[PDB]
Amino acid sequence: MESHKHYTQSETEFLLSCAETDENETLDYEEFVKRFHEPAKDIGFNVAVLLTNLSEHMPNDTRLQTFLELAESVLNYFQPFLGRIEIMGSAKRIERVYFEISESSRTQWEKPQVKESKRQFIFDVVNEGGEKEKMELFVNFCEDTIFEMQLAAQI
């Protein structure tokens, strides 16, 4: 742990708290990551949305960057998983939306029976399909690819 230059010596000892109680001065390999990792990746997610939700909504804040530059070992871990769209939200005003993208769905928007169905669609719509049915043809496309992404899963 010390040779990776990530944790300082005030943190390499805290990580070795007891961690075994087992007779050999060792650990358990996949149980120590079972103990402590996964009950802070979805707890810690909503923290990452909240610091994201404040920086984009409230700019020009000197007080916020002091936390924000400390969070960069989190905000550069969850940015693979942080899906950000924009909708016209119920008040005639456009408000951003933040959500959670899995890892069994960023790796099946690859797998080229799904990639070929995109390029067969993008060319079909930006060529033909008027403005009274453009976004209908998008929402009708998202329903199919979700069936494709289910289909490429059980293979």
């Binding site: 939200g89 005003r93 929402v139 998202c142 690819t145 992404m149």
Partner: protein, 417 residues
């Protein structure tokens, strides 16, 4: 339990097996280049050239059979899903097999009357309560004796008979059947693996465009070849009635000299020779010098060269080259439109640019139509107890099918900053 192990191997390797039934079908049509005349193959490398074709021609029918089993488990389940959606959204949101009863056209509408009598109708459409929704919406104007009757080792035989009506009428499945039914004929005669190099055409992109441009401007092309067969026909009736004495395909007059004084054989002479020449018809005709009809003959040939070889054969080539100019440019335009506007906003490369990487981050993070697809996959796994304030103004509007929630013109910088 071992069947679904193999059957899920072939659907995984379908795009990576169709590049194997091409590197084989070159190796057939390279050994087959050595034939010689009874037709018997010689050798150029060694004696083991004949068995490497009898090996290679049974290996090709096997691989061309695994590329339709892998098609039957990769893309034909999807074409069912896009078909069971459109039926189920027709008799429910609109009403088709109760109120409308479709016409003699749209045979797929007529064919899909066979499916709604089945037990397991929405097999792929995730929406197994259509048959309860119609009787609650259309059980009032029409009696629920009828709607209960219209809808409803023993497999879904009335449904499996419907499904094969969708697989066989499917476009890309027929090509995977014609690709295999030649490999059955490839052992009746070895020369039928020469019609497998036409998988180059439906395999590349700038060769699929040529094969489309022959028929893309097609509905005018028949009406222009159909003017060739009338101008050359009207050049027959003049030549048949006036100029029979020039039309000799014969030698010196001593021979049993062959003529063209018969309508059906003067006509095929004017089209097998009169079109493909360079000078129209004035090549393969005895020279007019000592005749009274000479001036009436130079006028006959010049307007043949001008109407059929200068005009009508240039604008038949013109509709096949300048359809290849549209279809290449169409693609170019699509790419340019993709790299100069936003898909969902529809704004421009200019207004978002205004900063380094201005349009790039606007479409990588702020809209990024991947994300609008993961967001709709989000609401399917979220429970309706858990929908927040905006994930249920969306999910109400999507169940309602209104779609006023995509950003029409503005995004974020068009009101803030």
């Amino acid at each position: 339990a071992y069947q679904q192990k193999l059957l899920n191997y072939f659907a995984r390797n379908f795009y990576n097996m169709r590049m194997l039934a091409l590197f084989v079908a070159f190796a057939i049509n390279f050994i087959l280049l050595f034939y010689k005349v009874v037709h018997y193959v010689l050798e150029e490398s060694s004696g083991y050239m004949e068995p490497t074709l009898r090996i290679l021609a049974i290996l090709h029918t096997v691989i061309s059979f695994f590329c339709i089993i892998g098609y039957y488990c990769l893309k034909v389940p999807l074409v069912i899903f896009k078909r069971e959606k459109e039926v189920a959204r027709k008799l429910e949101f609109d009403g088709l097999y109760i109120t409308e009863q479709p016409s003699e056209d749209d045979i797929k509408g007529q064919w899909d009357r066979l499916v709604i009598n089945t037990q397991s109708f929405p097999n792929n459409y995730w929406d197994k309560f259509v048959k309860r929704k119609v009787m609650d919406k259309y059980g009032e104007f029409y009696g629920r004796d009828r709607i209960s009757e219209l809808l409803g080792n023993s497999i879904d035989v009335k449904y499996q008979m419907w499904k094969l009506g969708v697989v066989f009428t499917d476009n890309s499945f027929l090509y995977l059947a014609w690709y295999m039914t030649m490999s059955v004929l490839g052992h009746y005669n070895n020369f039928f693996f020469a019609a497998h190099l036409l998988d180059i055409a439906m395999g590349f992109k700038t060769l699929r465009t040529i094969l489309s441009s022959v028929t893309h401007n097609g509905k005018q092309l028949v009406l222009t070849v159909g003017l060739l067969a009338v101008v050359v026909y009207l050049y027959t009736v003049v030549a048949f009635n006036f100029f029979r004495k020039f039309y000799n395909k014969s030698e010196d007059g001593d021979t049993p000299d062959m003529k063209c004084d018969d309508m059906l054989t003067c006509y095929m002479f004017h089209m097998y020779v009169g079109v493909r020449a360079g000078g129209g018809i004035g090549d393969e005709i005895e020279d007019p010098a000592g005749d009274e009809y000479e001036i009436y003959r130079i006028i006959f040939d010049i307007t043949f060269f001008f109407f059929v070889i200068v005009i009508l054969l240039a604008i038949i080539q013109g509709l096949i080259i300048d359809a290849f100019g549209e279809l290449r440019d169409q693609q170019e335009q699509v790419k340019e439109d993709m790299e100069t506007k936003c898909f969902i906003c529809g704004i421009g490369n200019d207004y978002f640019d205004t900063v380094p990487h201005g349009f790039e981050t606007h479409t990588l993070q702020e809209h990024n139509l991947a994300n609008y697809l993961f967001f709709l996959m989000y609401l399917i796994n979220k429970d309706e107890t858990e929908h927040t304030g905006q994930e249920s103004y969306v999910w109400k509007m999507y169940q309602e099918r209104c779609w006023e929630f995509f950003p029409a013109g503005d995004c974020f910088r068009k009101q803030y900053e």
